[PDB]
């Protein structure tokens, strides 16, 4: 017991007394010259390892250019749109309407191989433009104008030039604008252009996606890749089971180049029979995958299907995958926008409360790291997706959408701030000082709009009364005091409407509120005409005074 009723004899003591007055005592005291990827690279169309639908679509898209390039009439879901694009006809300048074939997918699938093989198969000469070039817009323009706007030096019998632009995702936005300018110049384009990227959702390729023949690469089929690795190992005199090759294929995430390089390192010549444990070892062949956002959100919000059933393994897997994804703010926005639409079993809302506490913890960490220049506070917000995985683990199949609420909220807030700054700029400086824009927004906007809309009958000005004319003059004066006016707007339905030149109705009005009676067309036109003649007579009065 830490508390003694009797005082200590030898050790030092400190007295404790309660409110009722009883003392307590506490103790104070050339086979060997080339790589295996280069040796077994495909040189014909029949030995490609990609999906056959993508190869056929790219070959048919490149054979639609034979009308304008080779001068011959005869060449010899996501699938439905591509089949519609191959049969939608040609433009009046005898060219396809999509002049760029855009190739996207994860690395090691064969996009560059498919582009080069399909270009050499259709009788073109491959012009390669990669990320090791200068990529400045002047050099980009010069290279594309050299590749696409001239004939061949060899004359008749010379191969046409098909421009293949590798790594277009890393290109600057001005280079993409140069490519789109030479794409849509009506100096007319006559040669096909192929663009290859690893990420289709790059910000620089947004306008390129709406104009190109988008060919998304699926991951390679494990049976075909296992057969190709078996053929490569049989050519090199190496023995391997289908099981260990399938283990290598699922280890390398269906990467052809990584699997062949891993086999080239693992075989050598000391041993022939490859073992399962060498592939299962993490020392050779494991590479850090850049996981997508939707895979991370699925891995967080859905448990894996049935070892791997331990909770700590899922904890570390979710943490490492969310760290390896990158773009942490987008992950946090997806977690914030997707965790309430799940089939939540927590009806007491405690999990939602502690998830929002974790989100506020991440926000406070971001603010403190960006305030005190102490960026060692950013090792904790990687544990936010694993917190959401622990709280909201389910065996169901959730529908994850892309986060858009916070960005739309920021865009609308910026638009409303611009509208507020436009509204206060028209007011006179004598009345600008009397109220802040915040107080004018909170107090003097909806009531001001109630002032500016009186109960006015559709009657001409000559039949009005004295009170009606005084009220109309006061209304026009108060409308001119805040630099407000009504102007016509054109509608697609065919009618004309009058609207405020600063549209301050959207600053005030809200969607779920009951509707109020608006001013009619005749009254608003009369108000605008009265504002114009009030400006005219104000100029006349200013001329008469001065």
């Amino acid at each position: 017991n830490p508390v003694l009723r009797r005082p200590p004899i030898l050790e030092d003591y400190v007295h404790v007394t309660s409110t009722e007055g009883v003392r307590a005592y506490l103790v104070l005291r050339a086979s060997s010259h080339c790589l295996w990827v280069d040796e077994f690279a495909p040189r014909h169309y029949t030995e490609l390892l990609s999906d056959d639908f993508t190869n056929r679509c790219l070959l048919k898209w490149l054979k639609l250019w034979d009308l304008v390039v080779f001068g011959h009439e005869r060449p010899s879901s996501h699938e439905q749109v591509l089949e519609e694009m191959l049969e939608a006809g040609l433009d009046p300048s005898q060219r396809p309407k999509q002049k760029v074939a855009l190739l996207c997918g994860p690395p090691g699938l064969g996009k560059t191989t498919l582009a080069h093989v399909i270009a050499r198969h259709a009788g073109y000469s491959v012009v390669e433009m990669n990320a090791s070039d200068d990529r400045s817009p002047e050099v980009f323009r010069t290279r594309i104008e050299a590749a696409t706007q001239m004939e061949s030096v060899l004359g008749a019998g010379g191969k046409p030039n098909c421009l293949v632009i590798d790594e277009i995702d890393g290109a600057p936005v001005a280079a993409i604008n140069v490519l789109l300018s030479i794409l849509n110049r009506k100096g007319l384009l006559m040669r096909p252009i192929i663009c290859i990227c690893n990420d289709q959702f790059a910000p620089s390729l947004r306008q390129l996606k709406q104009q190109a023949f988008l060919l998304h690469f699926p991951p390679t089929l494990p049976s075909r890749l296992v057969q190709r690795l078996q053929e490569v190992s049989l050519r090199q005199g190496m023995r391997a089971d289908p099981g260990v090759l399938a283990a290598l294929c699922e280890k390398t995430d269906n990467d052809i180049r990584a699997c062949i390089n891993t086999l080239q390192f693992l075989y050598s010549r000391g041993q022939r029979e490859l073992s399962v444990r060498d592939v299962q070892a993490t020392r050779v062949g494991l590479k850090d995958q850049r996981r997508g956002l939707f895979s991370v959100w699925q891995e967080v919000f859905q448990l894996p299907r049935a070892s791997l059933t331990s909770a700590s393994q899922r904890f570390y897997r979710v943490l490492h995958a969310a760290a390896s994804a990158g773009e942490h703010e987008k992950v946090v926005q997806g977690l914030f926008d997707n965790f309430l639409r799940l089939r939540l079993r927590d009806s007491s809302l405690g999990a939602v409360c502690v998830a929002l506490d974790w989100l506020a913890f991440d926000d406070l960490l971001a603010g403190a790291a960006h305030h005190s220049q102490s960026f060692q506070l950013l090792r904790y917000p990687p544990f936010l997706p694993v917190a959401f995985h622990v709280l909201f683990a389910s065996s169901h199949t959730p529908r994850i959408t892309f986060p858009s609420s916070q960005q739309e909220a920021q865009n609308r807030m910026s638009q409303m701030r611009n509208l507020i700054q436009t509204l206060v700029s028209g007011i006179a400086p004598a009345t600008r000082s009397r109220a802040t824009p915040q107080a004018l927004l909170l107090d003097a906007l909806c009531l001001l709009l109630d002032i500016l809309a009186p109960k006015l009958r559709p009657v001409s000005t000559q039949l009005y009364s004295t009170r009606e004319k005084q009220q109309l003059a006061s209304l026009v004066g108060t409308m001119l005091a805040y630099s407000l006016t009504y102007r016509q707007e054109r509608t697609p339905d065919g009618q004309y409407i009058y609207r405020l030149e600063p549209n301050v109705e959207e600053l005030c009005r809200f969607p779920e509120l009951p509707a109020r009676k608006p001013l009619t067309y005749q009254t608003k036109q009369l108000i605008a005409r009265e504002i114009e003649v009030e400006k005219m007579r104000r100029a006349e009065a200013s001329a008469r005074v001065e």
Partner: protein, 348 residues
């Protein structure tokens, strides 16, 4: 012009309420050695009117000749940020919170160039200039720390009048350097007298019942009371005692948001309330006022043994909102905590 601007008093002898404070402020600024001023009080109490009356007492009538001055201020990131200042030949009005988080650059550069130069004319003008810093409670603490040495170095040639709503957001170094002038809200009788004198100056008759209801609904805000009285005269020229008073749209939207909160306690209703709070935040409504309106409406639907916990939760999440940067997280956290508490109270 509206009724908020047409009948504003010009000098300290024409103020309808706080007349003893008006005489004290007249006696304060007569000699010219008065210190820096911190005019604080609730919104719509009449702080800016008394500041302009103090400027009318110091200089002549030329302080009413105002003009818009546009200033371009360079950040340390070399980004040009535009701010606007209202200035006269005798004073300047600056709102540094319009620059956002770069208000410290505005204090360090724009105010120091004003304070470091004396006035051109010393006969029509006095020996010192006045700088009006409006809404200093919205300033960050870095800008307030930049403010304090300029207030002491150049206080013989440049005086400062700081205006705010709450002095708790003002740091104690700034509050130690200035005299705090408290302007309370006008009472129901004062607002009724002001509205009656405005209606008598307009040739109208205002009943005592309608004036009392306008004073009660305005929450002792004379600006909003005058705006509501002019809206009631555009809506109906016979001033009836039981005439309806128009309401602001964001207040009734907040009331319907809180009614949607108390109607159902589900994550789907939480998503709908988050959408409503996004709609409130996009219209440039401050989130502390959203918290105040939510607490003002949620406590009407609570029982007597539940209101204290909801008020403590609202204060805690508003403090976390002030500490943080994304308001929607703390707003949804407060709504989720209230939904959990309300479900626990209803099921037990």
């Amino acid at each position: 012009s509206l009724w908020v601007d047409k009948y504003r008093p010009c000098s300290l002898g024409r103020l309808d309420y706080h007349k003893e404070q008006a005489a004290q402020l007249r006696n304060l600024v007569q000699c010219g050695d008065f210190p820096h001023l911190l005019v604080y009080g609730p919104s719509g109490a009449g702080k800016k009117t008394r500041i302009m009356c103090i400027l009318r007492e110091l200089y002549g009538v030329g302080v009413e000749k105002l003009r818009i001055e546009h200033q371009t201020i360079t950040t340390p990131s070399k980004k040009k940020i535009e701010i606007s200042t209202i200035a006269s030949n005798y004073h300047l009005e600056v709102n540094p919170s319009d620059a956002g988080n770069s208000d410290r650059v505005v204090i360090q550069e724009m105010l120091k160039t004003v304070a470091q130069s004396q006035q051109l004319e010393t006969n029509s003008q006095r020996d010192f200039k006045v700088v009006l810093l409006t809404e200093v409670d919205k300033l960050t603490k870095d800008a307030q720390h930049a403010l304090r040495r300029t207030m002491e170095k150049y206080m013989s040639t440049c005086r400062l009048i700081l205006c705010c709503n709450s002095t708790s957001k003002v740091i104690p170094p700034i509050r130690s350097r200035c005299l705090a002038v408290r302007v309370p809200a006008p009472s129901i009788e004062d607002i009724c007298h002001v509205l009656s004198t405005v209606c008598k100056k307009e040739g109208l008759n205002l009943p005592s019942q309608l004036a009392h209801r306008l004073a009660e609904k305005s929450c002792r805000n004379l600006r909003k009371a005058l705006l509501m009285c002019e809206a009631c005269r555009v809506q109906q020229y016979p001033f009836t005692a039981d005439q309806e008073i128009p309401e602001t749209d964001w207040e009734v939207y907040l009331r319907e948001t809180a009614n949607a909160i108390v109607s159902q306690q589900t994550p789907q209703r939480l998503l709908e309330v988050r959408g409503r709070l996004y709609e409130l935040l996009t219209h440039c409504i401050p989130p502390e006022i959203i918290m105040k309106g939510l607490l003002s409406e949620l406590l009407h639907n609570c029982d007597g043994q539940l209101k204290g916990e909801v008020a403590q939760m609202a204060a805690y999440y508003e403090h976390r909102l002030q500490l943080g940067s994304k308001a929607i997280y703390h707003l949804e956290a407060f709504v989720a905590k209230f939904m959990a508490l309300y479900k626990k109270f209803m099921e037990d």
